[PDB]
Design a protein around this ligand. Structure first.
Ligand SMILES: CCCCCCCC/C=C\CCCCCCCC(=O)O[C@H](COC(=O)CCCCCCCCCCCCCCC)COP(=O)([O-])OCC[N+](C)(C)C
Ligand SMILES: *[C@@H]1O[C@H](CO)[C@@H](O[C@@H]2O[C@H](CO)[C@@H](O)[C@H](O)[C@H]2NC(C)=O)[C@H](O)[C@H]1NC(C)=O
Ligand SMILES: *[C@@H]1O[C@H](CO)[C@@H](O[C@@H]2O[C@H](CO)[C@@H](O)[C@H](O)[C@H]2NC(C)=O)[C@H](O)[C@H]1NC(C)=O
Ligand SMILES: CC(C)CCC[C@@H](C)[C@H]1CC[C@H]2[C@@H]3CC=C4C[C@@H](O)CC[C@]4(C)[C@H]3CC[C@]12C
Ligand SMILES: CC(C)CCC[C@@H](C)[C@H]1CC[C@H]2[C@@H]3CC=C4C[C@@H](O)CC[C@]4(C)[C@H]3CC[C@]12C
Ligand SMILES: *[C@@H]1O[C@H](CO)[C@@H](O)[C@H](O)[C@H]1NC(C)=O
Ligand SMILES: *[C@@H]1O[C@H](CO)[C@@H](O)[C@H](O)[C@H]1NC(C)=O
Ligand SMILES: *[C@@H]1O[C@H](CO)[C@@H](O)[C@H](O)[C@H]1NC(C)=O
Ligand SMILES: *[C@@H]1O[C@H](CO)[C@@H](O)[C@H](O)[C@H]1NC(C)=O
Ligand SMILES: [Ca+2]
Lengths: 455, 623
């Protein structure tokens, strides 16, 4: 079995992704000063620990195969559980796949456009060619899914220590001019602080899918809250020790110029071989996308039992045991996302819908702990950590819409309510004609794509 | 038989061939053909996309005389702390580069200079830390800073010269020395070479008992660039200022670097003149003191030293030189060769020479620079400088607006001298007790900011130079409230020139022009909209454009005007009138561009051709 040292080595490699290479530009363009944008990586870094700890509670007491769909079924009933299954198939999961592949073409095409920004047609034609290739490889094969994963998480950590070591050595040589007079132009406001917590928290995406490790942990109840409260706080410490290593080299005015922040860094510090950064970051960013496509068939299976989502999506192909209808539908929605929007208009769109369901979950944590459920819970968290995560997330979901309204939020609210319409007219009322539109659809799809129900 | 829930063995009957087999492989091979046709399309777009414009090609420069911009500590002389206070005014003009003339520790602040230490700031301008705070404040605004560099001579108080007259160490050959007979205060020089300001160009030194060479006044001995010790010293000064963040240099007096080693006498212009009365620089043919053989390999060596700092993207170091006043084919050598790189452009001072505003005088300068220039080079247009009478005193107040609209719509980089956006003028008299060139001193008057003591420049008792008397009407504070002012038009042109994509890299077709009027268009291929600038330098006119362009509709919109009365008013092509210094930026749509025809391939100019794609919204260089 896996010990406590390995108990964190899985979670720390899980948290650090392609968010630390794209968000610094976006969190700084809203703080305007080096000083405050360093406390955002800590403030959101702590807020991600209390989130993952609260998720350890629901992960032990419910103890079901579903990821987060059970936790809303056990507390609020069937409508939030379905509404989450709806959004996590059309909003949360596809848009997070489009941001990872939009951020892989910012780093591949940034060197060939030295000195200026590349056109939008180049960073979308290259992203659309990554979504189709990542979703085709993961449908034809499974070995190739985990073949290149352990190497893609090596390049991810090789760069993380190269940027840190270089940004520390340069700090010993006295390059202190950038954070000498911090906080001078800090634009702290509910408008900026919220919009800068979105981009800071996107770099922590992956803390909710951390409960699966307990099955192989040596002593889960005693070590998992430990592997979390020392694993993620070790990562936020590796972010402020990496965002500091940016401002040591370049200034606050040159940061907002380039979208590929680490490419601007490798040219300034690693001139003999500066191509190493756009090459290694392109490895890790396409590896984190491989992790998203693997879990696409996961939730549709558990939601396929309760007749919430269509059961054809969980069918497996016979020649290769890969959830082909789940994948090619998971990517086809992403292609429709990279066309209208760009990275900054999608991190807001993603971190909006994702954070209301992140709130409803941990409120269900206390609501079940307060009145409805009296079952035994193996590990218990203090009462003050969940009430903070909900009071924080209620600020995160509601301040951006009122203070900095945008058209991205409208299309997000119209998506969930559209699923709410699909609840009554398709699963709640069970109309007669509603059936005869489903039955001929599923097996014809099965006929065309040679897929088979899993069990 | 369907029975929608279907395990493995049953559906293998249906899914075999019947109809659903051929769509599977034709759709699987479609997504494969597309994946290698999107990574093929992005490579085809990255390859055909042309290089974006550098920071010195993208926006105007702004030449500041640091002793006359803004005084901070009430001593009467501007300084580097006062330039930093006004950086927010400079960014309302959409300036990209701030060019500060020489501020080194000098013993002579004119006559091209006399520097005592190439690595210090003169006390009257501040201290070495006042400069580092200004270089930081400039970079945070998004601007760039280039400084004057003049490597030909030093002052006779420089440490190198004090050692050289003493014959100390290796410094004995930093300067050009020679033996000369000196008795009873009168010296015979080694030859008849003359100074640029006019007298024998050799001067006897009492400590060395030899004559030292100087092109300029006696306080400026010439460095000896023929020995490799001096070139490594000039190489460390270029490296000292680039490490502080300076974004490039402006090399001055470059034709005077090398001289002939044989020291033979020149040829007089009037051969039958007595060789003891030749005391004027203009009375000789200067074939041994200017532009010698190995001069261009020294300037190409300065460019390599600046290349060690211009490798990281976004921090290219600009190098510009001042042009030879007499020749234009000698000026174009500073552009370099297709395989040896040199100055990014030599500064075009030929517009600063016009003393009478005629249509053919301005037209001759434009076509002389653009046809003599090498192929893929970048032009620049400089309409003023510290060494010539200001534009309002050279041509007249009615030509301030027509002259800013000219240099902002021409191809290349416009270089503005401080106070030319508000229409400053020369002062009439001053009483200075320092050694300054009284012929070119009146174009350095303090900048007029508002109505106050000393036009708001000093806030002190006195200024180093008197401000112009009429600073109550022409100053920044008054001019940025008026609706139609020279400063208001200047902020409209530099904004239009900034984000148009048609003014920055469009073609330039110079249509025919009679005297008293100039007409030229800027056009790109896939833009489907052309600009037409009609500038009237004459008395007045009622000109019919339909005969001249043969591409224009009968109703065109006025995008800009110098009299500012035509904000958005449309006019009739049949009859347009221009009131003696009026300029219009006409703008219309057309599909027949002037450079595509055959009769205009002789009079259209572009640096790097690039067509436009509406569906891709990109520039591409394949067309
Ligand atoms: C996993 C790793 C992936 C790659 C990582 C990164 C690899 C690179 C890492 C690092 C870059 C290495 C250093 C490069 C320095 C600059 C070199 C340069 O400009 O060369 C050009 C070569 O001319 C060309 O045409 C170059 C074409 C480049 C195509 C890029 C690949 C696109 C698809 C990637 C795969 C997608 C797969 C998706 C599915 C997986 C110069 O040509 P030019 O005509 O002189 O200038 C034209 C351009 N400008 C300058 C004018 C603007
Ligand atoms: C060369 O230098 C001599 C000085 O030795 C200049 O002669 C003087 O010029 C000034 C002009 O303001 C007169 O006031 C003096 O009377 C002149 N001195 C004598 C002794 O005549 C001479 O002009 C210089 N040559 C130039 C400038 O071409
Ligand atoms: C060039 O200078 C010479 C003088 O060195 C001019 O020749 C004549 O010189 C005598 C000197 O006694 C004068 O009296 C004459 O008046 C001069 N002739 C003139 C002025 O025509 C010669 O003319 C000069 N040439 C030019 C082209 O200026
Ligand atoms: C897993 C990691 C350690 C593998 C990479 C090891 C090597 C290639 C790395 C580790 C630390 C790096 C150094 C860190 C800091 C600096 C200072 C900088 O001004 C120049 C580059 C230089 C000198 C780096 C050179 C490359 C370097 C020596
Ligand atoms: C699977 C097979 C059958 C069809 C695949 C079609 C794919 C390759 C096509 C369909 C629509 C296309 C997109 C249409 C419009 C845009 C916007 C443009 O600014 C960049 C390219 C981009 C984003 C295209 C990328 C390629 C694209 C996604
Ligand atoms: C030059 O020599 C004299 C005579 O000894 C001496 O006084 C003076 O200091 C020397 N100057 C320099 C710069 O060496
Ligand atoms: C000596 O000086 C006088 C100064 O009046 C001068 O006339 C004379 O020619 C000089 N003699 C020599 C030999 O230089
Ligand atoms: C100078 O301008 C100010 C406005 O800032 C105005 O109040 C004042 O009257 C002006 N003075 C003169 C003499 O015009
Ligand atoms: C200018 O003159 C006034 C008159 O008293 C004096 O107070 C002031 O100090 C003078 N300015 C300076 C800089 O000395
Ligand atoms: Ca010389």
């Amino acid at each position: 079995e896996l010990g406590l040292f390995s108990g964190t080595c899985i979670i720390v490699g899980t948290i650090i992704g392609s968010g630390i290479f794209i968000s610094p530009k976006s969190v700084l363009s809203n703080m305007e000063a080096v000083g405050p944008c360093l406390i955002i990586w800590a403030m959101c870094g702590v807020l991600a620990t209390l989130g993952a700890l609260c998720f350890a509670e629901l992960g032990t007491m419910i103890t079901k195969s579903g990821g987060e769909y059970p936790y809303l079924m056990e507390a609020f009933g069937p409508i939030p559980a379905y509404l989450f299954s709806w959004s996590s198939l059309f909003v949360i999961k596809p848009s997070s796949f489009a941001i990872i592949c939009l951020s892989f073409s910012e780093y591949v095409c940034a060197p060939f456009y030295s000195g200026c920004s590349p056109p939008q047609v180049v960073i979308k034609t290259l992203a659309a060619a990554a979504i189709l290739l990542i979703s085709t490889v993961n449908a034809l094969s499974v070995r190739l899914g985990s073949y290149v994963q352990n190497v893609f998480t090596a390049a991810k950590m090789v760069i993380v220590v190269i940027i840190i070591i270089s940004g520390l050595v340069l700090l010993a040589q006295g390059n202190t001019r950038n954070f000498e007079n911090s906080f001078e132009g800090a634009s702290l406001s509910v408008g900026s602080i919220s919009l800068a917590l979105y981009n800071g928290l996107w770099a922590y995406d992956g803390w909710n899918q951390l409960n699966y490790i307990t099955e192989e942990l040596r002593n889960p109840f005693r070590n998992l809250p430990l592997a979390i409260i020392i694993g993620i706080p070790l990562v936020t410490g590796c972010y402020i020790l990496m965002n500091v290593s940016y401002f040591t080299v370049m200034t606050a005015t040159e940061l907002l110029q380039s979208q590929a922040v680490a490419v601007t860094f490798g040219d300034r510090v690693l001139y003999p071989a500066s191509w190493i950064v756009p090459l290694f970051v392109a490895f890790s960013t396409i590896g984190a996308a491989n992790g998203s496509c693997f879990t696409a068939g996961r939730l549709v299976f558990v939601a396929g039992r309760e007749g919430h989502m269509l059961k054809v999506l969980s069918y497996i192909s016979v020649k290769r045991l890969t959830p082909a209808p789940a994948i090619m539908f998971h990517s086809m929605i992403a292609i429709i996302y990279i066309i209208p929007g760009d990275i900054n208009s999608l991190v807001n769109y993603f971190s909006f819908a994702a954070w209301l369901f992140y709130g409803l979950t941990i409120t269900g944590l206390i609501v079940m702990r307060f009145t409805r459920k009296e079952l035994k819970r193996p590990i218990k968290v203090p009462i003050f950590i969940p009430i903070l995560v909900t009071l924080l997330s209620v600020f995160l979901v509601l301040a951006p819409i009122i203070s900095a309204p945008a058209w991205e939020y409208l299309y997000c609210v119209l998506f969930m309510l559209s699923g709410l319409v699909f609840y009554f007219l398709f699963v709640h009322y069970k109309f007669g004609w509603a059936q005869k539109i489903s039955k001929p659809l599923t097996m014809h799809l099965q006929m065309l794509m040679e897929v088979v129900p899993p069990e | 038989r369907p029975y929608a829930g279907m395990p493995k063995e049953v559906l293998f009957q249906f899914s075999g061939q019947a109809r659903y087999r051929i769509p599977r492989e034709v759709l699987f091979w479609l997504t494969v053909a597309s994946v290698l046709l999107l990574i093929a399309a992005t490579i085809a777009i990255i390859a055909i996309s042309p290089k974006c414009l550098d920071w010195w090609q993208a926006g105007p420069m702004y030449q500041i005389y640091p002793r006359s911009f803004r005084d901070s500590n009430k001593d009467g002389d501007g300084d580097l702390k006062g330039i930093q206070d006004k950086l927010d005014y400079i960014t309302t003009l959409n300036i990209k580069t701030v060019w500060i003339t020489s501020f080194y520790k000098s013993s002579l602040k004119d006559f091209r200079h006399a520097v005592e230490d190439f690595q210090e700031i003169d006390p009257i301008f501040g201290t070495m830390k006042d400069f580092e705070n200004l270089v930081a404040a400039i970079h945070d605004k998004g601007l760039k800073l280039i400084i004057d560099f003049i490597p030909n001579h030093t002052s006779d108080k420089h440490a190198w010269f004090q050692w050289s007259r003493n014959r100390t160490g290796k410094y004995t050959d930093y300067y050009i020395w020679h033996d000369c007979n000196y008795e009873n205060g009168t010296t015979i020089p080694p030859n008849n070479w003359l100074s640029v300001y006019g007298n024998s160009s050799w001067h006897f030194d009492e400590v060395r008992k030899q004559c030292y060479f100087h092109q300029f006044m006696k306080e400026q001995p010439d460095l000896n660039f023929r020995n490799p010790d001096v070139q490594e010293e000039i190489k460390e000064i270029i490296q000292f200022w680039l490490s502080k963040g300076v974004d490039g240099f402006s090399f001055n007096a470059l034709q005077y670097l090398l001289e002939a080693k044989h020291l033979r006498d020149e040829a007089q212009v009037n051969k039958t003149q007595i060789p003891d009365t030749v005391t004027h620089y203009s009375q000789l043919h200067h074939d041994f003191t200017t532009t010698q053989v190995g001069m261009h390999d020294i300037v190409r060596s300065f460019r390599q030293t600046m290349n060690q700092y211009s490798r990281e993207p976004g921090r290219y170091r600009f190098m510009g030189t001042e042009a030879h006043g007499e020749s234009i084919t000698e000026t174009m050598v500073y552009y370099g060769l297709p395989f040896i790189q040199e100055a990014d452009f030599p500064f075009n001072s030929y517009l600063s020479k016009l003393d009478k505003p005629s249509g053919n005088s301005v037209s001759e300068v434009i076509t002389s620079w653009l046809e003599n220039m090498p192929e893929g080079k970048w032009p620049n247009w400089m309409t003023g400088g510290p060494d010539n009478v200001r534009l309002t005193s050279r041509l007249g107040e009615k030509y301030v607006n027509i002259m800013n609209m000219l240099v902002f719509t021409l191809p290349g980089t416009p270089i503005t001298y401080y106070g030319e956006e508000i229409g400053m003028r020369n002062i009439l008299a001053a009483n200075l007790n320092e050694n300054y060139d009284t012929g070119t001193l009146f174009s350095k008057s303090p900048m007029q900011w508002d109505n106050s003591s000393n036009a708001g420049f000093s806030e002190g008792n006195h200024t180093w130079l008197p401000t112009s008397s009429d600073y109550h009407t022409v100053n920044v504070d008054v001019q940025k409230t008026q609706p139609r002012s020279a400063l208001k038009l200047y902020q409209e042109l530099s904004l239009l020139h900034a984000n148009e994509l048609l003014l920055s890299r469009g073609w330039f077709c110079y249509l025919r022009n009679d005297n008293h009027s100039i007409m030229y268009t800027r056009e790109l291929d896939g833009i489907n909209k052309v600009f037409l600038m009609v500038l009237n330098f004459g008395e007045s006119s009622l000109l019919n454009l339909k005969e001249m362009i043969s591409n224009i509709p009968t109703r065109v919109r006025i995008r800009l005007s110098t009299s500012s009365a035509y904000s958005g008013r449309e006019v009739d092509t049949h009859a347009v009138t221009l009131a003696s210094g009026e300029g219009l930026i006409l703008e219309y749509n057309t599909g027949n561009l002037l450079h595509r025809q055959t009769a205009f391939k002789d009079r259209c100019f572009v640096s790097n051709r690039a067509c436009y794609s509406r569906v891709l919204n990109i520039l591409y260089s394949l067309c």
